[PDB]
Amino acid sequence: MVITKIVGHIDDLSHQIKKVDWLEVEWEDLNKRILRKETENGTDIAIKLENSGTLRYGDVLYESDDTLIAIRTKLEKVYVIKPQTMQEMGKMAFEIGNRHTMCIIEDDEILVRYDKTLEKLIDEVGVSYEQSERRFKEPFKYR
Template sequence: MIIEEIQGNINSSDLKAPHIERVFMKSDDLLKRVLRVKTDHGNEMGIRLKKKKELKDGDILYQDEKNMIIITTIKDDVLTITPDSLQQMGEIAHQIGNRHTPAQFEENSMIVQYDYLLENLLGELGVSFKREKRQMKEAFRHIGHSHE
């Protein structure tokens, strides 16, 4: 089976199916348009999206009256950073930006993929953070940039 378009998202609809199969994916794979995946029931399928669209947690790959196949993202190893002040946020954002580390923001927290060097830096600077496994709603996106 080749999936060429997303049928919707289970998180934004009232759709229910008596039988749900899941495709577990790393958040990095959500950025890919062409993939070969296997469901938790062992069924293999290809994903080849016609439109340039990023996959998201909960996307419905297939659906009929009895079955639904959805994407479930695997938890990422991340650092959740919670600065104590706006100045501290600016300083750590500057440091992270210099490293070209992609970040996501939720409420008063900055979330980055785990990096032991960044963990050491945060400790040295006295910035509040915790390392955790977290299911991200979107993939960490690297922004192309060069220092020319």
Template structure:
């Protein structure tokens, strides 16, 4: 089976529509969500090729295939993250500047900044006394590096 487009996302589906289908999951690391072409296997052992026609990243909950009885969706594996809890705008600005200088991608959930675990960033947060926790957490989308050069 080759998937060329995403059917929908499970979060936009009606609960009754989901419950009447058998669900298979494709477990992916968040880094693989940016790959438009890849070969994956469902949790039931079904091999699937993904070759997306449009240039979009996969997102947690994307439905790759659906018929009247079955549904195959993307499930993201938990990442090892530093969850930064700045107490003020000053702390947020300080750590955002430091991480930006390192070109480290971040995501935001509510008032928390999420970055993939890096021992150097952990040491920086300790040095700056900015509160953080290290957690295994699922993210909905990939940590994407933004292309940039210092010309």
């Protein structure tokens, strides 16, 4: 199936009444305009967005009576850094930036891919963190 335009967006997964056949992509695939991969259920998808569109987490690519094909990034090993203060957030975020390490700052959490070499640094800053599995839902803006 060739997709040239997004046909919807999942704002709330719990309200979805159709089965979702996810097209799992990499974090790096967000904001992209071209992609070809098979969905979980094996449907071949060739994305070539026209206009100025850019793939977003939750974007709906196709919808049938009982199924929806939508985009989500893969579940991966990460560190969920949780600063308790504005000062902790600023100092921790600064150190991650200084190391040029990609991350997503959502609300009061700092999400980065699992890398043990960061442990000494996070402890050094003295911020609470844990290893877990998460999906990166926002494109990393290489500013």
